[PDB]
Subunit: 118 residues, 12 copies
């Protein structure tokens, strides 16, 4: 499952673009990301030092949601997810890996642009 | 709260001993360890690369449960818990930090001695 | 007073949140941030490689205004302030440590959002 | 040649400002940045893992356009250009070094503010 | 076939478990481990600094037997095999990679538990 | 395509031999090597700036390195990363295999058999 | 003295075995191992972060008791003695270096098997 | 008590001056430094690779006497005490940590200026 | 002006002697060192972890006054100025870079020999 | 131990390799305990490889065990070109693997030992 | 004259080519490379761990003769001359920095192609 | 001879003391230190970045004279001699290794105390 898609991305000259193209081909999103059993009364910001999911999110272990960490390859950012917790809207939690790649954290409020920001 | 206890152990010449005496004087165990949301159908092994809590255990982020990582000091063992998951017998889950300090992982079964092993 | 506050924040699972709660409870801001003797005719940008205060700011050595450097713990940002100089509005210079935690540098003009930006 | 200007900025306490003042005085832009032969135009993003030049952009080797790398001095930002490819609008491709110092990559779309963004 | 299996385990969240599941599904053991040509007059201990095979064991190059080295990923133990020699009972020498993942070295006598120990 | 072949060699005990047998079995050469836009250079094989002469193409070094492309350790560190490799245009369809197959002349710095002496 | 024995073992392809064979041949044990004052009746555990000698043991400096540290060669284990304190039964303290090579620490109670354990 | 003082010094902008002020306020010296047992008196040099206490001194493990190692914070000077032994005049051995901070080793004879030197 | 002098010294086989010869030929001292705004109630010691200028000294940022840091080359002492503060007698504060190369800190009182010492 | 004396002698010499050469010149016994590989012996025959490559006229040895610097625990002057790889040595010279690699050259073209397999 | 020429090559995109061109225009070779006083009973090989000049060569300290070390810039090759001795034919000892750039060491005999080889 | 002395000192718990007793018992000083070819019109200072021998000294490559570097063991002091040049009075140049162990460089004038100082 994941090994097939991850192997495909790991050796592509652009891993993120390969995952994107893969998904656009109807590919199955990477699974096995780890979720936190949290309060859901957090700030709701995107990437935090402790789980911060609010009622509309899930909190995942950062490294388990990072394409480069999962492909065991060098990062192009080292890694701003590893060791942190990533808050993902529940309606998008079916693809934690793809969500951080496709979205942007607001430099001002710390929340995902389009899902919490302003 | 945790800062007082952590501060007290962090500067002690033997942090694990300082935490032990603190608990022996009736101190509240360290909190805010990070608990994982898992299916409880794992191997039940003590320290693993993915959450492995069985029916009688809770899975926690390793660094969250390490006295040394929580105290921000050097390790004595780098760290055997960081980046991994620690399964704690549920009835001892009120003190994950203290549990790993007091118990031994069986070299054969990989389970905690006295808790799930042999 | 500084050691008491820094100790409390250093061991909290979320140091920035601890200082913020601490200030909201009326705690005194961290002092002993080192100020620069400079022209005060500089660009006025927020974080620079040489002092750049304009007439409405004070310049401080970066590491001295960084909660993580002051606390001697790892950074959640490595460190964007160490080795640099931070310009802080003079009306907010009584809490350089909290000021940079609460505010945002504009990625376009390099000045603090709300204090100089645009 | 490039050595005269590079030497002048290398030892300045603010290398970027020195290059700025140099150009403001009519100095000739640093040359010999390397160009990538992008044959099937790319995403147009400012800084990427593989050449991505639009119809209206040129792709340069990241390190060749970096003032810090070209001056062989520590960066202030490691280096966010090294190992990557920088796409510069063809009309400003005569000063790749100065271009990245003067402009901002949009955090949302990844294109240069004022050149490609939105 | 070796690259297919290694690739499968390399990207699995638990590589050891992935290899176990593959062997249980009747998968063929990883080959190309390196063997020592020695006089089998050794102590017979499990992991040693020089080849130590007795008559009923084969000595292998440790790294060639390590799933993590063969997969080129980080180790979870670092590597206790790399640079050393692993003695495997002749009747289990058809799967050196899986053998060390499934068995235990006795802390007392240094021989494999269940094969030689006590 | 590239991912399939690179995965195959990345896990082999001898990555270079694996790419050799793949090519020999008719496999397609690894593509996506980064080509440099350049001029009239020395034509030397591995340089610090692009140096293709008229019978060559200049490629970004790591792009053409099997080990860098496979993200595994080198056996050579890497003599291509950060440099530029000039490859005879007649062979520029397999830059990864070319450097694996050929030798740089220690004396003139050009490829043995392609420019040397 | 100690230099002759140490050089002999330092260059052996198996230093531990060389020291063992040297001792079996009548050789004098390595001396000059450093001892420290235990400031309470210690736990009596074998290897600790501070001196833990029981009334039947003596506490030695770990590195001093390490054949590999003493021989200035890379370890095989990195070093699990260095920086710690090693407790040796008083009547066996004429050979601290050999004692730790010969004995096993119980992973359960942390005392030497045969001298304290269970 | 030790944790209280070390915590106060650890977070002060000048750890050494904080300790000096704490002592001048009548505070009690830091305890638990580790004392060496010598069978013979040594050279009496201040900082040595093996214990060297003469008749007027006591030898201590260097790190245990280092304010920075004890506070677990970065050194100012890496650390000239760690891994070596410090000889402290007996009349001042009630405060080994404060002693090395207040005194100077003679560059010529290697003993403490004012105690032993010349 | 500073770039030209620093350039000249940085490539010399003996950088300090080059600056010295440059000054003796009447060259202008290197400028742009950073100065601290402090109370001037300090200890007056030469090199300190926080500014310690007394009434007749200026406190400068360490790396700013280091010839090797300014030339971006290795140190022949690591650097004893970087990250610290250097107190320079007021009457010699026109040449901070040269001052520290020509003078000596008293190992005893910590002040500059000939200026403050004894 | 068998090789400790000769290794100690070379380890502290200003030129370890020259010290071993002189030692051999004076009739010294070559360094032993190099580890031999059990392999096909139908390999490429090249000198230093990532996997055993002995042909029928060679023996493959573990690199580090054949390296004077690794055996002497001192820094290298060539990290190390043998460590982690395998050395193929002509069967007729296999009595001195540590010395064979110091005295011979690998052809940069064919990868085989100059004088033993090259061109 | 050295600082001017080293400055020019240090910031050039191809340092060795800039030096070659500088010499071809009549530039004076770099001086101040250090020479060894030996008996000249050496093997005459090009780059050795000890001085090995024969009667027709000078032995230079390797780093003094290395363009990159002298220019304080990263190496292209780390550095094969640093810490070693370079034997240069006496007739070319007037340009030791240019000599090693222009010549080749014979892989077989270890001497310079064209000066000693064969 | 050289290897005999160096091996003895290398494994001694105190190398410099071992060499000192060896000399005291009639031992022949370590030879093969490398001598620099110089003008002998230098400053005569003790340890310099370039050869600085005056007419009464010899200049030697630093590492060649350092007991720790010659023994291949960790230093106590990385190394202050490595990379530099040591000036030794010609009358003592028969034992450069021991001379630097026995003597002291004046912190003020930089010459050896007793041989050049004041
Ligand atoms: Zn990651
Ligand atoms: Zn926002
Ligand atoms: Zn930890
Ligand atoms: Zn068990
Ligand atoms: Zn910081
Ligand atoms: Zn703005
Ligand atoms: Zn850069
Ligand atoms: Zn945009
Ligand atoms: Zn491994
Ligand atoms: Zn057993
Ligand atoms: Zn590569
Ligand atoms: Zn050629
Ligand atoms: Zn050790
Ligand atoms: Zn026990
Ligand atoms: Zn310390
Ligand atoms: Zn004295
Ligand atoms: Zn400096
Ligand atoms: Zn003084
Ligand atoms: Zn080696
Ligand atoms: Zn050949
Ligand atoms: Zn160099
Ligand atoms: Zn030749
Ligand atoms: Zn040294
Ligand atoms: Zn003097």
């Amino acid at each position: 499952a994941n090994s097939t898609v991850l192997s495909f991305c790991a050796f592509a000259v652009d891993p993120a673009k390969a995952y994107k193209d893969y998904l656009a081909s109807g590919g199955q999103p990477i699974t096995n990301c780890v979720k936190m059993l949290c309060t859901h009364t957090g700030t709701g910001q995107a990437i935090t030092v402790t789980p911060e999911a609010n009622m509309d999110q899930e909190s995942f272990g950062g490294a388990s949601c990072c394409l480069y960490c999962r492909c065991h390859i060098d990062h192009p950012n080292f890694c701003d997810l590893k060791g942190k917790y990533v808050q993902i809207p529940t309606t998008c939690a079916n693809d934690p890996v793809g969500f951080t790649l496709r979205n942007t954290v607001c430099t001002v409020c710390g929340m995902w642009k389009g899902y919490g920001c302003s």
